[PDB]
């Protein structure tokens, strides 16, 4: 995918789930975001499309308390504010 440089608080989040680089592909960023959502249990297994990120750094970065994984455009918009290409 395309090469992006996460801003400092997104880099911290990614490194907290074992990412090792300063520069990533978008596919890597999405992967590590998912690992973070899992390790912080920001979802309920019986409605797995919903992310609950209020009161978490993820919600601070994204600007929302919750979102659905089906909001493709909105998720990219929220991620891109935390990255430079």
């Amino acid at each position: 995918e395309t090469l992006v440089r996460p801003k400092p608080l997104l880099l911290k989040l990614l490194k907290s789930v074992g990412a090792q680089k300063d520069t990533y592909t978008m596919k890597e960023v999405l992967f590590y975001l998912g690992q973070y959502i899992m390790t912080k249990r920001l979802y309920d297994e019986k409605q797995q499309h919903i992310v609950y990120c209020s009161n978490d750094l993820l919600g601070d970065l994204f600007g929302v308390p919750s979102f659905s994984v089906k909001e493709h455009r909105k998720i990219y918009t929220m991620i891109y504010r935390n990255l430079v290409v």
Binding site: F31, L33, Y43, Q48, H49, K70
Partner: peptide
């Protein structure tokens, strides 16, 4: 779209 994530 399963978090353990990305199509």
């Amino acid at each position: 779209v399963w978090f353990g994530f990305x199509x």
